[PDB]
Each structure stands twice: as C-alpha cells, then as structure tokens.
Amino acid sequence: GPHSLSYFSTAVSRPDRGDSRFIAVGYVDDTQFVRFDSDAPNPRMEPRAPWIQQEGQEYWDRNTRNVMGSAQINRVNLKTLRGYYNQSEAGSHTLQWMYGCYLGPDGLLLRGYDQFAYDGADYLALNEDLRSWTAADMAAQISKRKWEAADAAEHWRSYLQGTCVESLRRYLQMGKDTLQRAEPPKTHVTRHPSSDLGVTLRCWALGFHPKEISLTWQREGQDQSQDMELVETRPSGDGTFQKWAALVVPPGEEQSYTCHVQHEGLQEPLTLRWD
C-alpha cells in the first residue's frame, strides 16, 4: 500500500446570504490531520491529529494564507461556473476540489492528482503526466484553455513531485507510531435468526487500521459474494475501523460456511466459522 497526502475541499454557494462557504481537510492515509472552515471566526488552518501540533508558527501561518487564498479563488469559481452553465443566481451549487500525492517505494512521487467536480460531476482533472488537463464538457474546456495559457500544470507538477511528497514523508515520521502501525482486526462470527428457512451468519472485523480490508464468505471452497450483505467500512472513532459481511444460510448448515479475512496487520489470511 502506497502512503498518501490528500486535501479535500468543498465550496458551496449561499445566495440567500450573498456569500459562500469553503471547507478543507487534509489527510495522511486514512488519518485526518488538519482542517479549515471559512465560516469560523478569525479562520485558521487547525490541527486535527496530535502529531501535527509540533509544527511551528510559520507552518500554520503559511497553511492559513494558502487555504484562505484558495477559498477566495473558489468563491469566484462558483460564480464563474454559474455563468458558464447559465444557472439561476438563486440556487446553491457545490464545487469540490481534491489534490494529493501517493508515495512510491523509492521515496518519489508514484502518482499525483488535482481535480474538480461541480454539483458532484467531474469537471476538470490534471492528467497523470502532470502536464495536461482533461475537461468534461464545453464549460470545463473554457477553464482548460485558461490553464493551458497560464501553464497551471507547472505549479501543480512542481508541488506534487516536490513539497507534497517531502511533506508526506515528514508527517509519516512525525506520526510514525500511529500512522505506520498496522493494527490487525479482531474477528468473530455471530448467528442471528432470519426465517424458517434461514439463519444469518455475520462475520465481523473490529479495531483494524489501515481501513483497507477483505471480507468474503465461502461454502466448501466456493465464493458467496453475490448473496452476501457487505457493509461499508466504518470508523470506530479512535482511528480504527469496523466492517462486517453477512449471509443467510440454511438452518443447520452453518459449518459449511467460512469467512475469510485479509488485512495488512495479519501475518496470514484468516479463516473462521461460527462456533
């Protein structure tokens, strides 16, 4: 698994108030570490993980200035896009922006990205060459031509290849005891009534980190993915995660079924059954 540093920003227009709101969050891997909210009084970039608090005032001042300027540009972007699409001035719209870097095994950039969505749909994205952009429609073509004229890709390529991965490496060191710790899942299978003709087996994985995990059910060697309910992986609230996978099986046939768990905290894939 490549580590990553990622910033996720949401800009929302608020015509009834005459303004906009911009929220940004930063993550290393699955761990949030900073936030910014333009509705906050005196708004600043703020810490959200303990290990970032060792950064000095220059870091917080620079982060604040950078995210504040970005909030101002995105406030204007909401108006610009409303005009490109000839939308009413009364409606709220959403512009999301996400950029970040994944770290290769050699300490270089494995992949960088910088993209936007408007009202949930892809708008404009930096291609993996970091030299060119892909636009989703005629509006985004206007933006793309602007950004080709300005050589906006150079600003992003330089960041992604340089400071993004160097920052990431620093944060991985700062937070090594949590960020670089894999915690394996605690696992068990529960049994619940379903009907006359069925019982539910639920395979649980609790307390694991990172969030990536595989839970599958088999019956005597055959995978059951088509008939199982697999919930979205969910946060515990303490930096770990939870997941379950459930299947309705015939009454009395529980021993034919095995749950299979893969996670980077386990030494070997686990097989378990209801007991």
Binding site: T10, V12, I23, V25, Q32, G120, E232, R234
Partner: protein, 99 residues
C-alpha cells in the same frame, strides 16, 4: 446530476455491555449535495453529539460521523435521524447491538 441519498449506520465503538461507558456512532456516507442534518437520538430526543469535519470520497460523495459518549443499559433506546433533499421524510435508523 441526480442527488445521491445517504447511507446510515448506527453502532457502538466497542461491543456494548450494559453499564459500561462506550461511544455511539452515526456514520452517514454516500450523499450529495452536502447539506444534511444528522441527529443522534436517545429515546427520541436529540443528543448533543460532536460532528466530524465535512469530507468526501473518491467518487465525490460526502461522509460525516456524528458521535458521543454513552453508557448503554437495558432500557434506553438509541437511533440516528437524517434529513436530506433525497429523503421524503427523515430517515431513522435504530441502534441494534448486532449491526
């Protein structure tokens, strides 16, 4: 361009044991637009629960965690109530110790 409805899970951090302090979570994901109201309820009454900073997944859908400390017991009922443009009436999910 169609709005995406929220998925909602309500669950405890740790396996529930009556009389043992714990944490109650309402994880709301997959939704768009981002305007949403998410309330944890104790016997139908809103709890003063902390909410995560707004974020989103790779597919641009939003997610939020609403959470608070609680001590489960044999009497109190907990749920999570969600209001969103895609929902005709508030979506209520009960806390079930088995989900």
């Amino acid at each position: 361009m169609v709005a995406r409805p929220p998925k909602v899970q309500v669950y405890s951090r740790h396996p529930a044991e009556n009389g043992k302090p714990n944490y109650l979570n309402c994880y709301v994901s997959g939704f768009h637009p981002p305007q949403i109201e998410i309330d944890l309820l104790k016997n139908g009454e809103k709890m003063n629960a902390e909410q995560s900073d707004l974020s989103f997944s790779k597919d641009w859908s939003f997610y939020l965690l609403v959470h608070t400390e609680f001590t489960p017991n044999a009497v109190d009922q907990y749920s999570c109530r969600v209001k969103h443009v895609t929902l005709d009436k508030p979506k209520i999910v009960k806390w079930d110790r088995d989900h």
